[PDB]
Amino acid sequence: MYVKLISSDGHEFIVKREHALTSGTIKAMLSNEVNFREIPSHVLSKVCMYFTYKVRYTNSSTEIPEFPIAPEIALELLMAANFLDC
Amino acid sequence: VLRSVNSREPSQVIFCNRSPRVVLPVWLNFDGEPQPYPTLPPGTGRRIHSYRGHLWLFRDAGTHDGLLVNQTELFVPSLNVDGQPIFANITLPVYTLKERCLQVVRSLVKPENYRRLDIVRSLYEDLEDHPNVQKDLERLT
Amino acid sequence: MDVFLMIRRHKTTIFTDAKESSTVFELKRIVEGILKRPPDEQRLYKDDQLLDDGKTLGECGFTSQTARPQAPATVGLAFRADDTFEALCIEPFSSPPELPDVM
């Protein structure tokens, strides 16, 4: 079961519904495509990788790697994270 | 309230840093004051002498970001069974994406310039609200 | 062993995982479930290389330590419009702006 997250520049990211629901804001926008007028693809792609990361490593015994964020996207990703509450 | 108990009962412990951070161990003394101890580089360990009922937490030595120890915030040495030391596995938490973003921005922008950033006041306040051992100690209490 | 992937065509990107032991054709079934196009109307690629249905993802170089949750590996996808397959086309993501002076 999947949902579609669409960036400001029209990139369509298709992710597991349960991964998207990680975000309280997306849960709200779904209550199954969501458009993000302010989030470009180079940020939303990273947001999607975070879902996968969080779901994979939450309450896991195996050692946890650092979630990587390039300096050039950090400010925009901060803003999206704040909006999406995660 | 949160303080080590003065048990005087030895307990040997392995601090094992399974994080990519430089680790600052912090012992909470008998008055509840945080006492810093020597740091651990990434992937290193130290066999150390502590005591039963003592309280420890662990931070990024550079930024004071919170780390986990055996999957929780506080580590209390227990009785050594059959002479074996207690293992204290220090790891990264799964940070929220917001907290991770704040870490990276904090690492790139001097505090003098957080206000120069083009973001909502509340994000400026989140940046300025640095990970803080005192706040955490109050919270934990 | 789980591998974490982005299956990408034009401006479509599918985040999913699969087993290292699973096949290229089985990944086409996954895409079929999501985009409603049968395996015979799909080509999957690793960079410019056309992947063969019978091969495992691991054989095609998608391994658990390179196709990671926080940095998934990319699989290209091309559709057959009727008689012949379009060329492989993946729209790049947008460019981040210049770092502000204070960064």
Ligand SMILES: CC(=O)N[C@H](C(=O)N1C[C@H](O)C[C@H]1C(=O)NCc1ccc(-c2scnc2C)cc1)C(C)(C)C
């Ligand atoms: C009886 C008692 O409670 N003693 C205390 C004590 O010995 N403590 C408090 C903690 O339980 C740890 C222990 C102590 O200070 N052990 C010596 C020690 C020295 C270095 C280190 C570390 S931490 C990272 N690297 C090293 C070498 C750990 C322990 C003091 C002397 C501080 C009042």
